[PDB]
């Protein structure tokens, strides 16, 4: 167990092996700097002086970020074998004000009640992709992980604060956070904001944190068929090819003429 | 255990008690006959199957293309969505079965259960089999889903009335299905309903009569599970006429987990706020 910084061209099989062994990693140059700027600009345009879904606020988020090949290559190998389809769970902007204290160390899957039935050898209930807007430093509250704690049994006490390993990222790097990885944001002891944005996916049989059916139709039709399924507009296929999120007998996209 | 037939005014505690011991039961007079007949009429009025007259009628113009495929029961039948889904027995049981562990529940799926004459016996199964998380679940854990099978026609042994195996909900997950001789047919009049948790081994019988065995099913499951059916193709006029309870059941409102954490949100607010319900 150890925090690994790997390049963008790392083989997918190496990321999964590091994910199983260490429970987290950082994929550098996950997004290019211009995509990092576009999503912040689009969010700033929407909430120009209340924030809603990131896919509603940012065209780059729903058209570019949610089509990221790394997110889908990882999610396919993590959820595919057991659950079949996956879809978008939630997405937020992670903005730390200067002077913010250390966030409590937690696992993301704690709000799944079925996580208590889960065993550390089972596939994760959700996975998070935390992408850096500003740089992440140990002093501005960058996310801290506890490599290997994803294998701890249910009910294991949170890691001690001294066992937390800060994650250092340039803008565009991504930290991969499976739902079982103990982690928390640090205390921003600097004068500037530490800003990041995240995506999360989970099995299609799980209800997402966010619904996207308040989004206008043109916003939906400009999405790829993959992102449309991610955001809850297409019927999902379980591993047995039994279908959930159906429209009576047929597909939801056929009933809505997507 | 034993298959219990209980009257409508049975206390809620006794019903959940029976569900814990035997894993299933029937509530007599769950619905009145006229209500379940309204659902069928509304379904027939939506599908609009061609009904051949007494003799050939020399049809030329406007032939065919009238029949629609069956959609959600909440879309086809106003009685289903405006009355059946507000049933106090469904919500009393779902509250006590899902509330303490999952918080909110919502609609999972409906079904038109019509057994053809000569239909053979259905494989004996558990309804929660299509939840992969059922392999992690213990028999003492709460159920992953519950089904309410309401009879439209009479349910008999010969017409393939649903069979249950009382107590089989407590078997370990690796347990083989019950033998055919273990199954207990469920005899029901129109309006009765079979209460069917996801862990109860059951199956439709062979319909060895010349008439259809007809009925309707509702199912609910915890709010953190994705329902079989989506209802977001439904017209907005339809959603406005459902109760706030049914709007939450059919996926138009934000759901609350047990720890007051919200899922099915609209960004940071409620879905019903972003849609202006
Ligand atoms: C909005 C959320 C909900 C999320 O904050 C929730 C469930 C929010 C409420 C919580 O009790 C905690 C603090 C336990 C929590 C997490 O700890 C997460 O981690 C989650 C699951 C986030 C996550 O994992 O990914 C980011 C992108 C995100 O938007 C997510 C889905
Ligand atoms: O913002 C961060 O660095 C970490 N945030 C979380 O883990 C969270 O919000 O669940
Ligand atoms: O039709 C019946 O009596 C029982 N049906 C089922 O168990 C089913 O459709 O899953
Ligand atoms: Fe987190
Ligand atoms: Fe069944």
Residue numbers in the entry:
A (entry chain B): 4 to 52, 72 to 280
B (entry chain C): 4 to 280
Q: What's in the article?
A:
Here, we report the biochemical and structural characterizations of the unusually promiscuous and catalytically versatile Fe/αKG oxygenase SptF, involved in the biosynthesis of fungal meroterpenoid emervaridones. The in vitro analysis revealed that SptF catalyzes several continuous oxidation reactions, including hydroxylation, desaturation, epoxidation, and skeletal rearrangement. Fe/αKG oxygenases utilize αKG as a co-substrate and Fe(II) as a cofactor. Through the oxidative decarboxylation of αKG, a reactive Fe(IV)-oxo intermediate is generated to activate a selective aliphatic C–H bond, which is normally difficult to cleave due to high bond-dissociation energy, and then oxidative products are generated following radical recombination.
SptF also catalyzed the formation of cyclopropane-ring-fused, highly congested 5/3/5/5/6/6 and 5/3/6/6/6 cyclic skeletons from structurally distinct meroterpenoid terretonins. Interestingly, the unnatural substrate 15 shows a different ligand binding mode in the active site. The D-ring of 15 forms a hydrogen-bond network with Thr148 and Leu199 via water molecules, but also forms a hydrogen bond directly with Asn150. Notably, the lid-like loop region was not observed upon the binding of 15, while the conformations of the other active site residues were almost identical. In this structure, Phe133 and Ile231 are located close to the methyl groups of C8, C10, and C13, and potentially form hydrophobic interactions. The C6 enol group of 15 is close to the iron with a distance of 3.7 Å, suggesting that the enolic hydrogen atom is abstracted to initiate the cyclopropane-ring formation reaction via the proposed path c in Supplementary Fig. 9. Interestingly, only the N150A variant lacked the activity for the conversion of 15 into 16, suggesting that the direct hydrogen bonding between Asn150 and 15 is crucial for the substrate binding. In contrast, while Ile63 and Asn65 on the lid-like loop region are important for the formation of 4 and 5, these residues are not essential for the reaction with the unnatural substrate 15, suggesting that 15 is mainly recognized by active site residues but not via residues on the lid-like loop. As a result, all the variants still maintained 24–40% and 56–84% activities toward 10 and 13, but dramatically decreased activities toward 21, 24, and 28 (<20%). These observations indicated that the lid-like loop region is crucial for the steroid substrate recognition, but not essential for the meroterpenoid substrates, which is consistent with the absence of the electron density of the loop in the complex structure with 15.
